[PDB]
Amino acid sequence: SGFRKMAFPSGKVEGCMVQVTCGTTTLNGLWLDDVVYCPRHVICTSMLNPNYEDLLIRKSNHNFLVQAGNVQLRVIGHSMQNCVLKLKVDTANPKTPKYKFVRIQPGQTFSVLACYNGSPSGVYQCAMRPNFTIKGSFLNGSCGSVGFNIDYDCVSFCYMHHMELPTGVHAGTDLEGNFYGPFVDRQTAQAAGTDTTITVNVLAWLYAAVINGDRWFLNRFTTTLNDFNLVAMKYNYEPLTQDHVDILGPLSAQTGIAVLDMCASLKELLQNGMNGRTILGSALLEDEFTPFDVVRQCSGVTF
Amino acid sequence: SGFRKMAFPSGKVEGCMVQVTCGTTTLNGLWLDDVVYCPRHVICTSMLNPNYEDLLIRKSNHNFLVQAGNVQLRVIGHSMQNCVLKLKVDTANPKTPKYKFVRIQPGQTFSVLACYNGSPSGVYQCAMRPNFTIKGSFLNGSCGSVGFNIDYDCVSFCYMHHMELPTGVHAGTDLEGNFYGPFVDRQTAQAAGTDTTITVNVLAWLYAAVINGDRWFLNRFTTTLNDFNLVAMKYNYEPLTQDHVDILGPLSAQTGIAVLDMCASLKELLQNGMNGRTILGSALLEDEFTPFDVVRQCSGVTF
Ligand SMILES: *[C@](O)(C(=O)NCc1ccccc1)[C@H](C[C@@H]1CCNC1=O)NC(=O)[C@H](CC1CC1)n1cccc(NC(=O)OC(C)(C)C)c1=O
Numbered sequence: 140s141g142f143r144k145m146a147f148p149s150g151k152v153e154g155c156m157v158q159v160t161c162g163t164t165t166l167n168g169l170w171l172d173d174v175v176y177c178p179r180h181v182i183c184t185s186m187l188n189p190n191y192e193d194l195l196i197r198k199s200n201h202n203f204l205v206q207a208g209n210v211q212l213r214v215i216g217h218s219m220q221n222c223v224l225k226l227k228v229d230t231a232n233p234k235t236p237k238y239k240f241v242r243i244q245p246g247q248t249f250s251v252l253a254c255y256n257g258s259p260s261g262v263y264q265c266a267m268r269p270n271f272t273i274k275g276s277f278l279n280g281s282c283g284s285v286g287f288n289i290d291y292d293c294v295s296f297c298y299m300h301h302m303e304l305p306t307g308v309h310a311g312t313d314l315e316g317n318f319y320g321p322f323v324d325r326q327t328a329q330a331a332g333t334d335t336t337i338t339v340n341v342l343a344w345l346y347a348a349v350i351n352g353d354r355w356f357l358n359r360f361t362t363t364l365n366d367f368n369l370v371a372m373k374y375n376y377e378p379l380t381q382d383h384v385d386i387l388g389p390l391s392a393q394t395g396i397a398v399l400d401m402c403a404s405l406k407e408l409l410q411n412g413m414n415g416r417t418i419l420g421s422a423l424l425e426d427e428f429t430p431f432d433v434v435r436q437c438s439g440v441t442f
Numbered sequence: 443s444g445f446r447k448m449a450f451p452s453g454k455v456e457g458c459m460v461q462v463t464c465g466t467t468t469l470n471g472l473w474l475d476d477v478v479y480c481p482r483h484v485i486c487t488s489m490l491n492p493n494y495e496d497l498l499i500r501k502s503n504h505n506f507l508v509q510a511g512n513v514q515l516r517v518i519g520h521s522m523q524n525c526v527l528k529l530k531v532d533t534a535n536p537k538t539p540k541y542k543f544v545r546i547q548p549g550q551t552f553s554v555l556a557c558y559n560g561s562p563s564g565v566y567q568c569a570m571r572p573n574f575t576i577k578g579s580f581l582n583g584s585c586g587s588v589g590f591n592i593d594y595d596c597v598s599f600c601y602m603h604h605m606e607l608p609t610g611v612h613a614g615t616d617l618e619g620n621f622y623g624p625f626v627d628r629q630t631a632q633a634a635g636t637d638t639t640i641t642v643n644v645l646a647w648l649y650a651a652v653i654n655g656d657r658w659f660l661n662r663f664t665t666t667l668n669d670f671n672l673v674a675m676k677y678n679y680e681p682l683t684q685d686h687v688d689i690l691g692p693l694s695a696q697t698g699i700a701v702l703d704m705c706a707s708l709k710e711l712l713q714n715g716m717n718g719r720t721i722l723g724s725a726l727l728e729d730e731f732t733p734f735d736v737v738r739q740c741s742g743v744t745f
């Protein structure tokens with residue numbers, strides 16, 4: 140038993156991490172087969188309004204210093220993939236895992252391997268927020284650090300780090316170089332929109348608390364999907380859908396507590412607070428665990 | 443910027459993890475050079491009051507099934523090291539990192555690589571509590587999962603998992619097989635003692651909040667080490683020492699806030715609560731970040 144914010148084991152990703160330098164700019168790259176992926180802004184030098192097309196036409200293969208430990212990698216081709224650069228190199232990464240590029244949805248979680256100069260510093264879990272930001276831990280040099288999920292032996296890469304927004308939250312792309320959210324890889328006035336609480340996740344985490352013997356917030360009441368959503372909206376909670384109710388099925392079954400019964404507990408925590416009590420060691424309602432995360436950790440699925 | 447519960451990259455440990463079976467009992471082992479370490483209780487079968495000396499005398503090398511992926515490992519020697527078993531095997535782990543066995547102190551943090559059947563499931567950070575338990579996430583089969591720190595390229599192994607106590611907290615040994623706390627690898631009446639809050643860690647985390655621009659709890663007041671400890675004791679907080687004050691030095695310098703000034707903020711949070719506000723996204727005072735953890739993550743030290 141017990142319930143922790145758990146990241147995927149990072150080894151498979153650590154073996155893909157390289158350093159990419161243009162001029163005085165160093166950041167991280169991801170080396171899979173004979174390609175290195177990094178943020179295209181590695182090629183910026185002065186950048187309120189740069190033209191990346193121009194900047195990339197003016198680069199040559201030999202301008203890109205790529206380092207895998209010591210072993211320098213020779214770049215033999217380059218191309219822009221939206222906001223990512225694909226650096227074709229002369230050698231296929233022998234440590235390349237089974238992998239795929241997947242875009243995630245707001246509410247889904249992934250592990251981040253925070254890297255500096257191609258070197259892994261640490262691993263943590265976060266969620267894609269409803270406003271397409273992530274609440275990460277990123278300093279100067281973390282650009283190109285990636286977010287990922289693991290299923291069996293297969294790494295699903297879902298995020299590459301690009302920037303910090305004024306509120307201290309983070310924005311990036313999928314590995315096809317397409318931004319999550321209305322953000323651009325330029326210095327502009329851009330700010331995170333208003334964020335909401337991921338309702339289905341809070342419900343998953345209340346199920347986790349029950350599976351772990353934290354039961355104090357449970358009540359005999361049930362509510363309707365509509366009367367619940369009436370209260371949720373009031374507190375800046377995402378609407379809950381029949382699809383969400385269906386996804387919470389396995390946890391409903393494991394605990395024998397109907398989803399709409401748990402929604403009655405959530406409505407009451409939203410109206411009355413926790414009255415100086417905690418749930419799974421937290422004094423606030425946690426929303427960065429998906430239904431899958433709770434099943435994975437309360438069942439002991441390995442990779 | 444940002445501040446997250448960050449684990450060490452786990453790759454170096456993932457390559458050491460093996461499966462160990464005696465009879466119907468399977469758990470995890472740690473394979474370094476030509477030795478596999480696991481909990482000695484792998485040899486129990488019926489165990490209110492077993493004699494392990496007897497149990498081990500009656501085992502043979504061929505009774506121990508050791509599996510590194512598929513590749514079965516041939517056991518050519520065995521011996522008991524306190525509550526750990528050392529299984530001498532015919533082949534040195536080619537993935538053996540630079541490593542050492544270090545015992546940690548209550549208040550210190552480490553990463554856990556939770557494993558099932560020799561396979562890594564996930565990685566999270568926790569602290570050795572003042573009562574020598576850890577608040578982990580462990581199910582049937584997690585025994586032999588290890589706790590570790592990384593410095594440069596060197597893995598300091600500090601914990602091996604053995605059991606869950608009645609309150610849903612976890613107990614284990616160092617890698618020399620010596621228990622943390624007054625616990626034994628038998629079924630008995632044993633329970634965690636009363637736990638305390640790790641004061642020096644709460645202060646480190648308030649420094650982290652300041653470095654991240656969370657400043658609302660700061661005040662113009664200072665307090666004495668003695669008048670602080672008078673309030674702390676009242677709230678089940680560990681006493682703070684001049685050594686603790688000296689360890690918080692670098693964070694004092696970085697923020698220009700004297701330790702005893704921060705203690706005035708902590709005294710006020712203890713007497714008045716947070717008044718429905720949060721610090722680094724928490725509604726309670728966090729005590730599982732060491733001064734080192736805050737410097738490591740607010741400076742971007744890699745491994
Ligand atoms: C990324 O470029 C990076 O890590 N680059 C390598 C590097 C940078 C600086 C010094 C040495 C090496 C960073 C990652 C950032 C740094 C701070 N935290 C992060 O997550 N990304 C940027 O600096 C990013 C590049 C833009 C997308 C093309 N960028 C540029 C300019 C401004 C900001 N942010 C900003 O102004 O935020 C506030 C909070 C307002 C200070 C930015 O992220």
Ligand SMILES: *[C@](O)(C(=O)NCc1ccccc1)[C@H](C[C@@H]1CCNC1=O)NC(=O)[C@H](CC1CC1)n1cccc(NC(=O)OC(C)(C)C)c1=O
Nearest residue numbers: 140469483580581582583584585604605606607608627628
């Ligand atoms: C460990 O032995 C293990 O993982 N063994 C392999 C295995 C066990 C069961 C089924 C298949 C394979 C476990 C780890 C435990 C399991 C649950 N959470 C954990 O952290 N350790 C034990 O089971 C431990 C062995 C004792 C030290 C020699 N043990 C034995 C008996 C009782 C308990 N705990 C217990 O009763 O806790 C409560 C909360 C009271 C149920 C125990 O941990």
